[PDB]
Every structure is written in C-alpha cells, then in structure tokens.
Amino acid sequence: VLENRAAQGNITAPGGARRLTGDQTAALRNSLSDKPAKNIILLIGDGMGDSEITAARNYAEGAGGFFKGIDALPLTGQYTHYALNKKTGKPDYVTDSAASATAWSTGVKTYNGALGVDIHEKDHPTILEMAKAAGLATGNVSTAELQDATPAALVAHVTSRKCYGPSATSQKCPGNALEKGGKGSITEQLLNARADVTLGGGAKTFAETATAGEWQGKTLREEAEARGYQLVSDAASLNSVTEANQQKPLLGLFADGNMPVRWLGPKATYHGNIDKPAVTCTPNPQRNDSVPTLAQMTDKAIELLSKNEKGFFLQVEGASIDKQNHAANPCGQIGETVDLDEAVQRALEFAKKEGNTLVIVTADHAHASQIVAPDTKAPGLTQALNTKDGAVMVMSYGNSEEDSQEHTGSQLRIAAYGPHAANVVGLTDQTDLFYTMKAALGLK
C-alpha cells in the first residue's frame, strides 16, 4: 500500500507504468484497524465519479501522475447511491444532490429533493446532530451556498431542498414553515443546530427576515448575531479567529451565492474537439484572493475543531465539480477537483500525525463527463485540452439536449483511511456510510 502511486519510470518501457513498488499484503494488513475513530472528516467531491477523477488527473498530473490527496487513500471500494420514488417507494436509479446527502447523514433512502426526511416526510437524525449530542465538536464546510443540499442535509429536515429561507419555505415547505409550527427553513434550522464551525457561501439568504419565533422581524444574520455566532467574511477575518465553540460558534459566509471557481476555460461545444483549438486552462480572474480556498477552510476548520478533546466530525464539500460538469466546462470542473485534492491533502496530513482520524473521500453520485478519443465525432458537447503530458485529452458531455448535463447512476469510488476504514471496501451502499461513521465514533 505504498502511498506513492505515480508511474514508476519510463512509461514506454517494461514495468515503467507500474504504480505498485511492491506487495501490499503486509502494508494493507498494517492499515486495518478495529480501534475507534476519535475524529472524522468526510470529503464529498460533488459529482466526482471515477471519470472526473481520471480526467482531472490526466490534465493536472498526466496519465501516469497521481493525486497526492485524492489518490493516496489505501482502502477502496465502490458504492450504490440510488434514490426512492416518493409515491411508489420503488428505486429511482439517478439520485440528486439532496436524496443522496440524506443517506450518508441519515442512513435512510429518500426521494429526490428531500433533506433529512424519509419518503414519509418523517424526520431522522443526521450524524452531525448525534455527534453534537455525544459531546463532539462539529463543522461543515463547503464551496457552495450553505443552504445547498450537501451542507444542509447535516442540519435541516425539510421536504424540499428549495426551501432555503423564510420566503421559499412558506410556499414550498408550508409544513416546515415557522409560522405553521414547522422547524423553519434550511437557513433557520442551520442556525439552530449550531455546529461549531460552518463555512461556505449563501450569504444572500441570511438577509431574509424571520416571520415567527423570538427573532421575528430580524433578518437571519441579525439572529446569528443575537445568538453568539461570530461572522467572518474573508480569508483575513477567518485566520483572525482563534476559537469556535457552543458559545463562540464561527459562521463564515464568503459569497452571496456560491464561491468562484478557480479555473477559467471555454464551455464544451458541439464538435469542439474537431472545429476548435485545444485549450489550456487558466486561472479565474473573477476570484479574489480574499475568498479563502477550500483547503484554507478545511485547514482552519480542522484547527478550531481539534481543540475539543472528545473529538470532532467534519464534512467538506468541493461543491462546484458538479456545478461545472452541468455547465459542460472541463476547466472549471478540473480546477475544482484539484482544489478538493488540496483539501484532502490537509485532511490526510492531520489524520496521519494524529492517528485516530478516519478520512473518507467520495462523491454523492456520478455525472456526465466522459474521456473520449481525440478524433471523436460525438452527438454532445466536446472539447480538446492540453494535458500535462503534452498530449491532447478530449472530454465529452452527451446526456442532455437541455442547458444542463445530467447526473448518472453508475456506482462510484469511495476511499477511506484510518480506524474502521475497512468498511469502505467492496460494494456497499451509500447508507452504510452513515452506519460506518456512527460506529467508528461510537455515536449510538
């Protein structure tokens, strides 16, 4: 299980493409622990199936390369992530962002759109919740708006992922409407859960005013204030933070909607690989250096959370890999996958020094992107890219005639490292994750 999996030499020569330097049996044995996990970090690469991991590596590190973080986890497996059809209760083979996040955080399958509720619209506790119960610290970082499905699944129990704040809930989730005696909108339930560290975007929703409860009349941000939440808005004030706890919880909103993608590149187009020049991704000028990178947020969050002796549970989401995959933008997608990789490196570094940390990197569901031959005449959107190898790689998006390339139901890679990582091996189900995390922590 040598943690260096790049090609061993000259890929044109016998044995030069090999990634293994020796027999793993001994090494793997030594990486298998029954011992309890003290902390847990779950990295979700949104829409990061094996094709996205492959394409991003080929570009960033070259075909024979190797992601120091993403590719460095010793225990691997694949898992099913199908959802349920609300009415019939039958499987719906292509899950969305909300139906899936609910399963690893809850342990029960649900219909597309549901956050923290089963098909009967019944609530079930999330793992961030139970953790907090047991005494552990909790954090939730993301590069998308916190109201989005992935960060939200940990804290809200809503009937529709679209009920971000007071305005939308009153009409899409009337039974969750605060005025209707419901727990409140995603943003409200988030502010109630009070995880120790929460970072992402979606500041806009915090501007809506609450309609019931104590803080009626006051915007959600003012409520955050009145409730002891420290609010940071940039890289700067973030490092300025020295503690985050139940009386000093940190809440960082680094963008109105989602944060900006790191790379800029043209959108894939019809016969783009043929009628258009190969592209080389460049950095995104719209992104300011004050907006912290996912790795910075992961780092600070790990820093603040590692003080609680009981341990901690942290969930990091490289949100936009899924975003740009829908947008048919190979460069944005790849940049984002590299970004998550840096994030995982930080996780893996802490995990490695600490010893009792269980790191898990996976995705919520597959997506559109496919790596095809350079001469492909495909019916979808395509584009040619100049990889690190000095070769051309062509990516293809061909499952939607609409403005957005759809998700896919193929099972995808799941990798873990640490205490109890052995349960991530083989075929499992996305729900098993919830049970795997809960027992590694001894959550009950």
Annotated binding site: 46, 148, 150, 317, 322, 326, 364-365, 407
Which partner in Zn ion, Mg ion, a copy of itself, none is near 310 (CB below 5 to 8 A by kind)? none
Q: Which of 40, 48, 73, 235 binds a copy of itself (CB under 8 A)?
A: 73
Q: How many residues does the chain have?
A: 444
Which partner in Mg ion, Zn ion, a copy of itself, none is near 55 (CB below 5 to 8 A by kind)? a copy of itself
Task: Tell me if 64 sits within 8 A of 9, measured CB to CB.
Answer: no
Q: Which stretch binds Mg ion (CB under 5 A): 252-260, 314-322, 388-396, 424-432?
A: 314-322
Q: Of the residues 97, 100, 105, 142, which is catalytic?
A: 97
Cβ nearer to Mg ion, comparing 253 with 351: 253
Q: Which stretch binds Mg ion (CB under 5 A): 42-50, 53-61, 71-79, 374-382?
A: 42-50
Nearest-approach distance from CB 55 to a copy of itself, in angstroms:
8
Q: How many helices (H) and strands (E) does the chain have?
A: 14, 18
> At residue 180, what is the residue type?
K
Task: Tell me if 117 sits within 8 A of 123, measured CB to CB.
Answer: yes
Q: Which of 143, 407, 418, 437 binds a copy of itself (CB under 8 A)?
A: 407
Interactions with a copy of itself, residue window 121-180 (CB under 8 A)? 124
Q: Which residue, chain included where needed, has tokens 């940071």? A: 232
Q: Name the token pair of 382.
A: 């395509």
Binding to Mg ion by residue 42, rule CB under 5 A?
no
Q: Which of 36, 60, 66, 219 binds a copy of itself (CB under 8 A)?
A: 66
- Convert residues 416-435 into a mask of x (bound to a copy of itself by CB under 8 A) and - (unbound): ----x-xx-xxxxxxxx--x
Task: Tell me if 294 sits within 8 A of 315, measured CB to CB.
Answer: no
From the list 294, 389, 354, the residue with the least C-alpha distance to 35 is 354
Nearest-approach distance from CB 104 to a copy of itself, in angstroms:
11
Q: Using CA atoms in the order 95, 100, 101, 107, what is the torsion angle rounded to 10 degrees?
A: 160
Binding to Mg ion by residue 102, rule CB under 5 A?
no
From the list 380, 437, 430, the residue with the least C-alpha distance to 93 is 430
> At residue 304, what is the residue type?
L
Cβ nearer to a copy of itself, comparing 300 with 407: 407
Binding to Mg ion by residue 72, rule CB under 5 A?
no
Binding to a copy of itself by residue 280, rule CB under 8 A?
no
From the list 323, 327, 326, 321, the residue with the least C-alpha distance to 267 is 327
Q: Using CA atoms in the order 429, 432, 434, 440, what is the torsion angle rounded to 10 degrees?
A: -140
Q: What's the CA gap between 86 and 88, in Å, rounded?
A: 6
Q: For residue 355, count other CB atoms closer than 10 A to its CB.
A: 12
**Interacting residue ranges for Zn ion, rule: CB under 5 A:** 46-47, 97, 322, 364
Q: Which of 5, 46, 64, 99 binds Mg ion (CB under 5 A)?
A: 46
From the list 374, 420, 412, 417, the residue with the least C-alpha distance to 396 is 374
End-to-end CA distance of the chain, in Å?
32
Task: Tell me if 43 sits within 8 A of 359, measured CB to CB.
Answer: yes
Binding to Mg ion by residue 143, rule CB under 5 A?
no
Q: For residue 429, count other CB atoms closer than 10 A to its CB.
A: 17
- Complete DSSP assignment for 209-224: BP-SSTTTTSBHHHHH
Binding to a copy of itself by residue 383, rule CB under 8 A?
no
Cβ nearer to a copy of itself, comparing 54 with 237: 54
- Count CA atoms within 13 Å of residue 56 on its CB side: 28
Burial of 124 (0-12, 13-18, 19+ CB in 10 A): middle
Binding to a copy of itself by residue 442, rule CB under 8 A?
no
Binding to a copy of itself by residue 105, rule CB under 8 A?
no
Cβ nearer to Zn ion, comparing 364 with 432: 364
Is 33 annotated as catalytic?
Answer: no
- Count of residues touching a copy of itself (by CB under 8 A): 105
Which partner in Mg ion, a copy of itself, Zn ion, none is near 229 (CB below 5 to 8 A by kind)? none
Which partner in a copy of itself, Mg ion, Zn ion, none is near 132 (CB below 5 to 8 A by kind)? none
Binding residues for Zn(2+): 46, 322, 326, 364-365, 407
Q: Which stretch binds a copy of itself (CB under 8 A): 47-55, 130-138, 290-298, 318-326?
A: 47-55
Which partner in Zn ion, Mg ion, a copy of itself, none is near 69 (CB below 5 to 8 A by kind)? none
Binding to a copy of itself by residue 436, rule CB under 8 A?
yes
Q: Which stretch binds Mg ion (CB under 5 A): 107-115, 142-150, 268-276, 326-334?
A: 142-150
φ, ψ for residue 342 (rounded to 5)?
-65, -45
The residues carrying an active-site annotation are: 97
